């Protein structure tokens, strides 16, 4: 007596993300051997974390030049991964595919100016509890911020803490929300000595606690 399969109806249809592996249609083939091939990266997140990438700025240039006028805030950008400032960054590009992201995002600021020019820069993260960014270096002092003088070590890295009501935050801000989903982040040059026409390069990389999940497919 043949076993009765009693196959179900309405399920078992082929799925693009289905875990099931298709039956082999060819004989076993041994491919050319590759052992310890250089540059292999097991996880996409590790590559973003291992190597930092630049942030888009005025006229497609990454470094924020010291304002000619007396402005203490060089640039202010939304904390959300889908932000114009981070539009060209590699970390946002991998993050765009993932539905939502969690964990701290590291920002690396490295001074690229002559030895005679010395300037002091402050990076302050503002939580989304106000209609607008800290207006000035003093007003923004109350929120989490780091002030670093430019010395022998050109690059200072400040990790943006991830704090939100929801455990996970959407990578791309929806059109319906007229305000940033998460908090803006502002870079302020509190004091500059002979820094006219001096550029500071700012970059963003995945944090140690940073993680992405629920991969989906947004059009790029």
């Amino acid at each position: 007596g043949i076993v009765p399969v009693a196959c179900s109806d309405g399920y078992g249809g082929l799925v693009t993300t289905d875990p099931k592996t298709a039956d082999p249609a060819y004989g076993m083939v041994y491919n050319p051997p590759r052992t310890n091939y250089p540059g292999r990266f097991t996880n996409l997140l590790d590559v973003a974390e291992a190597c930092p990438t630049f942030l888009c700025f005025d006229d497609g240039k990454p470094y924020v030049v010291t304002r000619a006028d007396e402005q203490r805030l060089l640039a202010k950008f939304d904390l959300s991964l889908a932000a114009k400032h981070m539009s060209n960054t590699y970390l946002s590009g991998i993050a765009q595919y993932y539905a939502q992201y969690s964990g701290t995002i590291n920002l690396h600021f490295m001074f690229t100016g002559s030895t005679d020019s010395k300037a002091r820069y402050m990076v302050a993260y503002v939580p989304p509890g106000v209609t607008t960014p800290p207006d000035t270096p003093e007003r923004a002092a109350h929120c989490i911020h780091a002030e670093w003088d430019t010395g022998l070590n050109s690059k200072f890295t400040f990790s943006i803490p991830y704090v939100s009501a929801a455990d996970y935050a959407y990578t791309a801000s929806d059109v319906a929300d007229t305000t940033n989903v998460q908090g803006w982040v502002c870079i302020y040059q509190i004091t500059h000595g002979k820094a006219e026409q001096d550029t500071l390069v700012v970059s963003v990389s995945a944090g140690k606690d940073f993680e992405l999940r629920l991969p989906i497919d947004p059009r790029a």
Partner: antibody, heavy 125, light 108 residues
């Protein structure tokens, strides 16, 4: 819809302070920088003053300390008062809202080149 | 700044207005803002950042800036296009936004 309206005296006696008020409707006055631009008759515009979201109250350097600008978020009104008004400085006054907040402040808007004035309003002489 | 007092372009013909200042007023890195003002009405911003059009502005308007010269070119000219055009940029040496003398575009 975005609407800016200017309310103030058209004729003022010289050697007196001119006070103007910009009545804003359509957008929250705390999320957009407002800039006061004055133009001289048949002459090129001259940016006069501006106030950012949090009330930076930046003033044009050439006429700095000759005028004071105060903006109240609750009443949705931006007020610009010019002291020592003179016959030579006679032109239409335009109050506009910058897309960005505190984009420049020392210069009343358009210093970055990323955000531009969205609504210039009816204007007032 | 220094720009032509008036430029005349026929309907359906591209018209180019050139705004020229100084290295300090307009840097190669820096950009200028183009404002179109109808007589008897408040000024309207057509080009912001010197290469883009503000929301609610038609795609025909084009802005190109080379060196110290910023040029606004209008294609498919229409009756509404006739207006006074002002180019606005921020001069680092002056430390105050500097506006152009004014260019009036007339359609024949």
């Amino acid at each position: 819809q975005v609407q800016l309206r200017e309310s103030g005296p058209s004729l003022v006696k010289p050697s007196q302070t001119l006070s103007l008020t910009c009545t804003v409707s359509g957008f929250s006055l705390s999320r957009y920088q407002v800039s006061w631009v004055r133009q001289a008759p048949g002459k090129a515009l001259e940016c006069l003053s501006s106030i950012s979201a949090g009330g930076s109250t930046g003033y044009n350097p050439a006429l700095k300390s000759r005028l004071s600008i105060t903006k109240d978020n609750s009443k949705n009104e931006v007020s610009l008062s010019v002291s020592t008004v003179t016959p030579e400085d006679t032109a239409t006054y335009y109050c506009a809202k910058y897309t960005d907040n505190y984009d420049s402040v020392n210069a009343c808007g358009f210093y970055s080149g990323n955000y531009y004035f969205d609504a210039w309003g009816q204007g007032l002489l | 700044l220094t720009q032509p007092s008036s430029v005349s372009g026929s309907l359906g013909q591209r018209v180019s207005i050139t705004c020229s200042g100084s290295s300090s007023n307009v840097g190669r890195g820096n950009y200028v803002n183009w404002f179109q003002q109808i007589p008897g009405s408040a000024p309207r911003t057509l080009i912001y950042g010197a290469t883009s059009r503000a929301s609610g502005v038609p795609d025909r308007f084009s802005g190109s800036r080379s060196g110290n010269t910023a040029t606004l070119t209008i294609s498919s000219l229409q009756a509404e296009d006739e207006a006074d055009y002002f180019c606005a940029t921020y001069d680092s040496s002056s430390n105050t936004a500097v506006f152009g003398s004014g260019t009036t575009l007339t359609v024949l």
